[PDB]
Amino acid sequence: AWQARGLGTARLQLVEFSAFVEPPDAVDSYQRHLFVHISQHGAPPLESVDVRQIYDKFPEKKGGLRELYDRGPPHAFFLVKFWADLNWGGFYGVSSQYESLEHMTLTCSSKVCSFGKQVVEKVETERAQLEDGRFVYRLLRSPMCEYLVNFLHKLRQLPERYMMNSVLENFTILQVVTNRDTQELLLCTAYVFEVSTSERGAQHHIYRLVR
Ligand SMILES: COc1ncc(NS(C)(=O)=O)cc1/C=C/C1CCC(F)(F)CC1
Secondary structure: OOOOOOOEOOOOEEEEEEEEEEOHHHHOOOOOEEEEEEEOOOOOOOEEEEOOOOOOOOOOOOOOHHHHHHHOOHHHEEEEEEEEOOOOOOEEEEEEEEEEOOOOEEEEEEEEEEOOEEEEEEEEEEEOEEEOOEEEEEEEEEEOOHHHHHHHHHHHHOOOHHHHHHHHOOEEEEEEEEEOOOOOEEEEEEEEEEEOOOOOOOEEEEEEEEO
């Protein structure tokens, strides 16, 4: 009844997320490869995962999942399982878009963790743009962190897909979107990763985090 049908809340919905690479010859004939992609441009509730199970994948720390979930609100917390498409230097980019009925200034933080420990963090702020009665937040074509571009190139070298999955078992990303002015948390997404078989493109499965 009040359980989410997609990644978002009544205050802020994810519209699209993609991590991609455009090869150098895309100026001649445009193409882009999506490593991972969520599009939310009716349905039953999303499935749920108990947040305690994924606590180990994420560090106990200030700004960590356990502390954040305790501060709430619980309904803003999601877990995304990605099967990444690693079958493809070029431009490596990330694009995010959100919507709301409120006019807000968002702070979006992406925390990359390896073996639970935070390795890199990217923090951006985006002001709303009023369009057709609703407010849109566009963080498009952001350059991917060089740590992740380097990690992707090493990962694609591995000779077996199961070795890629072994490495990715210890690799997570935590995305926190907060109201810049109030500091209240609007959306928190935990990401876990596997490699898709070489024949299948990227897919995802979204869960509500409950406790
Ligand atoms: C949720 O993902 C992301 N969120 C945010 C960013 N932002 S950032 C730190 O500024 O780069 C990057 C990613 C990259 C995802 C990659 C990870 C490695 C992969 F699994 F092999 C393919 C997908």
